[PDB]
Amino acid sequence: TXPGVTXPGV
Amino acid sequence: TXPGVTXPGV
DNA sequence: TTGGCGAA
DNA sequence: TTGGCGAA
Ligand code: NA
Ligand code: NA
């Protein structure tokens, strides 16, 4: 996720 | 780092 | 080398 | 499979 917590996605 | 941005370190 | 974050 | 986050 994120960042943070990529995306999702990407 | 962090998380985010572990530690460092660990 | 290790940390393992945080879903679609 | 991809994203590549962010130093000691
Ligand atoms: Na290294
Ligand atoms: Na998977």
mmCIF file of C-alpha atoms (C1' of nucleotides) in Angstrom, chain D:
data_model
loop_
_atom_site.group_PDB
_atom_site.id
_atom_site.type_symbol
_atom_site.label_atom_id
_atom_site.label_comp_id
_atom_site.label_asym_id
_atom_site.label_seq_id
_atom_site.Cartn_x
_atom_site.Cartn_y
_atom_site.Cartn_z
ATOM 1 C "C1'" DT D 1 4.147 -10.485 -11.399
ATOM 2 C "C1'" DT D 2 4.289 -5.679 -9.951
ATOM 3 C "C1'" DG D 3 5.261 -1.755 -6.729
ATOM 4 C "C1'" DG D 4 10.962 -0.520 -4.881
ATOM 5 C "C1'" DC D 5 9.117 2.663 -0.296
ATOM 6 C "C1'" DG D 6 13.752 3.985 2.866
ATOM 7 C "C1'" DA D 7 19.855 3.438 6.134
ATOM 8 C "C1'" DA D 8 22.743 1.654 9.171
#
